Design a binder for this molecule. Sequence first.
Ligand SMILES: NC(=O)C1=CN([C@@H]2O[C@H](COP(=O)(O)OP(=O)(O)OC[C@H]3O[C@@H](n4cnc5c(N)ncnc54)[C@H](OP(=O)(O)O)[C@@H]3O)[C@@H](O)[C@H]2O)C=CC1
Ligand SMILES: [Zn+2]
Lengths: 129, 87, 115, 209, 145, 146, 342, 96
Amino acid sequence: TQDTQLIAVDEKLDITTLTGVPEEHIKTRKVRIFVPARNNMQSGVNNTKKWKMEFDTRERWENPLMGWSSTADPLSNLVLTFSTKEDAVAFAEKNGWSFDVEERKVPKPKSKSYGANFSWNKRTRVSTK
Amino acid sequence: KLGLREIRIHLCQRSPGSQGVRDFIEKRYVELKKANPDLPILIRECSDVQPKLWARYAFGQEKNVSLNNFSADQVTRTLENVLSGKA
Amino acid sequence: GTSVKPIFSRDMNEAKRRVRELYRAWYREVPNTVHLFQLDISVKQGRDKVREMFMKNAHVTDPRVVDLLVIKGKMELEETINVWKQRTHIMRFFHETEAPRPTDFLSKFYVGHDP
Amino acid sequence: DTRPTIRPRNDVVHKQLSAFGQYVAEILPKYVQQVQVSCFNELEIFIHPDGVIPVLTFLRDHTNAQFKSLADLTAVDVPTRQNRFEIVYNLLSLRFNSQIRVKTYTDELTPIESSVTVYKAANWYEREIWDMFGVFFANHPDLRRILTGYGFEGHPFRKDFPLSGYVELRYDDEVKRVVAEPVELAQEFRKFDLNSPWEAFPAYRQPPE
Amino acid sequence: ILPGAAYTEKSATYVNTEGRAQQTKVAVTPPGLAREDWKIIRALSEIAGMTLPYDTLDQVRSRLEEVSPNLVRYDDVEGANYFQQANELSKLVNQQLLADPLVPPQLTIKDFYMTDSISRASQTMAKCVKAVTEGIQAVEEPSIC
Amino acid sequence: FAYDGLKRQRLTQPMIRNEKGLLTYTTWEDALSRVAGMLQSFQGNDVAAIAGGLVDAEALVALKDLLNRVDSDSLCTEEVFPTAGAGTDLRSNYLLNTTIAGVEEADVILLVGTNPRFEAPLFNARIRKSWLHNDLKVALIGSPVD
Amino acid sequence: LHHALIPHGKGGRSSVSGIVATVFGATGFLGRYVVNHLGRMGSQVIVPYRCEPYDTMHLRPMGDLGQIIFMEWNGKDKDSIRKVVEHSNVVINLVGREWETKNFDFEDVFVKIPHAIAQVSKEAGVEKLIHISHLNADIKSPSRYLRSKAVGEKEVRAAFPEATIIKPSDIFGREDRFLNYFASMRWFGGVPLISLGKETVKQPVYIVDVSKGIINAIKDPDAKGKTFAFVGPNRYLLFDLVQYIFAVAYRPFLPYPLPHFAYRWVGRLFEVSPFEPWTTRDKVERVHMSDMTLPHLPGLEDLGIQATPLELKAIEVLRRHRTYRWLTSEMEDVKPAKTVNI
Amino acid sequence: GVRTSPTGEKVTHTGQAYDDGDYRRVRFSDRQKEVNENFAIDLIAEQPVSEVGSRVISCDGGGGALGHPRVYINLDKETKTGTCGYCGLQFRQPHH
Ligand SMILES: NC(=O)C1=CN([C@@H]2O[C@H](COP(=O)(O)OP(=O)(O)OC[C@H]3O[C@@H](n4cnc5c(N)ncnc54)[C@H](OP(=O)(O)O)[C@@H]3O)[C@@H](O)[C@H]2O)C=CC1
Ligand SMILES: [Zn+2]
């Protein structure tokens, strides 16, 4: 499409050689690819429509001077939104992170009927509205 | 003494290769338990897992033998060989 | 698909070539910086550090990738022979102040909950 | 206008730029992939990466375009998109007091021809983009770090890069020189999940995938 | 008194009552000097002499796969079979039923909260037990929220 | 409302018995060394282990392998299941075969000698939900617990 | 262990190692590096001082906020020591000078106060007192310093039985007053060595190794009661050592013999200065004292620290003394000196 | 108010006090442990309760815009004087 000496490279993409992630943080860290759960105390579902990749939690010790939440894992507060799952995971191997994939939990379709609240025989008659 | 501390089979519920061991446990299993009540024949199963037999001998000893496409009597002999050496 | 646009190199071989004159330049470069930068390490103590990066960077196979860090190495070499870096910058390669980190599982277990 | 809060709309400019959008699209159908004008009258020229040099020369030299000022040269790293980085140019036309935006896409490995020839301003912008993101620009006069410290590894503006980074600095007396240590915050960055669980804009609702 | 982590301080695998092995991710690190649980035995085996093979979390799950192939497959009921052979295997002994009526240990809301070490330790659980034992007025937290 | 138990009485450091018989804090090495030292001595079926309630499958398999390299197949647990017959061999025995969701299409149920409300509260809710909608006929043999 | 002393975090500036050190006399050569290692891992250091706080400013930028808190203490007042070491678990003693001020005799800064820290620390509740004394410490040595250190070790050991005693040989480093001593000898004509200094064998040790030795001794649970002798890898005859120093500095070497009684007279003249003396009669004796070999004494490699030969890190001390001519000269320019080995 | 710890420290309003060992106590020596004497907990108790006669009572906190968002306290439960959740001022019905 370009006539620019298109070599047919086959080896899977690995840019971990260049991103500069230190040796500890590239192999040991395990990332999790999941759809965020709907915050149960709310009711809206806008926050559960984008795949997100986050890293495992590490030590959180209190600073001696004043009680803090000091940590020493730079990859702690780093989440990344992703449209679809295969695109999210494609980032993981490309950056060589041992990934763990969940599946998109979605509400199963329910059947609601206001007429059921007042039935003649069925034991679904609501006691008070 | 390394005699048959426990026996573990891992078969698939639906894989055609696992069909052989499924028939074996369907017929030639109750007799095995009555023969060796002490020896626990674990049948930990799963899906898409090739039929596989694990044996546990004495201190940290474990041997492996696949049961892929093994016939009914084929796996009975395989276990019979395993528990033949009750030591 | 499999067809990708290569940076400079056209397969592994000249990609393997480019890492050579980087090593050719780096090796010639070590003794004068030890003199010019007034380093504390020996001339011998610089070649290994130049060396050990190279097969530390050995699992890489993609020709495009290989050519990508040979530019980074060339740039690092570029920013070295004009004394643009300083003693601290060069010495950062020698992990000196950072105490040795354990490797065995038992020592990992003793220090803290971390893999 | 009864409405005192809503920003006024300029349909004349909207029609004017949209016609020029069809113009540039017809002249260079080889590189131009998409052309759109936003609600606030800004024209985005979606080109293919190999069109960075040809398309730019057209808007810089054609009599009817005359975009002779490189406003800026940025990239927005989108980890989602297959080719993550997206190089963005902004051009200002002195003669026709209009602004255009040519945007192209690029992954980590594929290089983009340097626009130094068509826009000599791009030269220093060229260095920054590689330094912050890692997009290597082909046939550049001198590609080098311009912002990060000497010997700094990694590309900071890349999304996967942590906010605090990996390397700290301090003075250590047994070496009598500034030394680098692994990052160790006295306070971790308190990240806030400040996203409403309710849809904000029905107009921009994504299709029900 | 080798201290271990808790169910919110590790990446363990707990299986439910229907055979659905679920993973529990780490939320807060173990307090004090306590380590993970499998990191105790593995460290203990190395010093003792009979060193265990697995050294990382992925390794132990792989071994955990070796012992049983369902406790690694996450969030999927590996529907078992073979109810019938366990039946004729069962009528062997035949035992004999006693006369004690079937009485569950939990009979009233009172005994619900005091079940496990985590529940017994907690103060809020004790307050709920107090709330249901005596009358309906001796429990309140002063708060003008 | 049980997270506060995590902040209540907790073990932080390894502790071993002193001369008099009072547990005292100590380093990890000697606590492991004392355990490892006299685990080496005794072997055979004289080394047991009783796993508790909130245990990790990783922890179970680690203890199982460690306590089988001394040849001690006495790995026990608090809950008791009849070993007569299939016992632990056949998975179909010791689990909810029908799956929790299955109770939402069952016709009749037979709760035998249990109080699911305080044993497995969520499981009781599914019975109620299916009892509410599908009109399941619950039968209980045992205590008259509500 | 106290809940505020449980080790926490990967070893770093903000890490809680769990050590509450009380390094005494840290405002000096030895004290400078020991706090640096203590500060690096992260450890509350009480660092008492007596001098002007300005001279303690360089002690500040080597630890996290609120980790190098300073306190004012006096050597002849027990109450100052008790306040400084009140809430702590490890006490490091580095007090002691090489001259004789009118307000402090040699036996004072090596017995009297070192007794005071030793006695008060036990009453307060410290568990890892580490007192430092010269390796050559002999009761009947010709020099009072070497005598005072020997009786000093005896007294602290009695008061604090489980007090690790570190016995360093001559320590070289940037501000060492050992390599600089011979380097500065060029000013006064040639380099005067008694009998050409051909009958005195010295075994110096680099400063950082002894600094890591103290840190490892604190962490090591077996340092209780033991007496370590920190010595370098090789022993060098003093004449060859001075040959090595002046070769590294590229200054001309002009040795000449000097009878012992006349050098003692020279040391007397230099003591007259009411400021920091350059050479005392005691100092002249020390240069003559060859490092006694004590193989029975547990050395340095048992701790884990590998000694660094003086040949490697010698330009650090002597690059400053070089003129502009041979300023950029490297290590390999000057050959390693001959080493009389054990 | 401000009490004294067994070590000698001053407990604050939150009740924080470094215990006996508490190596962190070294900072306060040669210094002071800053404690505010005007304890908010007991500085609001002595304020009298208003005997206003109604069923719903507003509380601006004084000064109008200078106060806190206007909340309506329900003075109906005749066991416990209603208090504004913003300032703690106790309001009560005049016992009929
Ligand atoms: N090669 C060597 O130097 C060796 C030294 N040692 C011993 O190690 C110790 C430290 O050596 P080094 O660091 O080189 O010595 P320095 O003279 O460089 O530092 C001595 C330290 O002790 C303090 N100090 C000395 N005298 C008093 C006093 N009377 N009252 C209060 N504080 C005092 C000093 O405070 P200030 O600076 O304000 O006076 C300073 O903090 C000494 O006891 C020394 O004899 C042992 C073996 C080898
Ligand atoms: Zn109010």
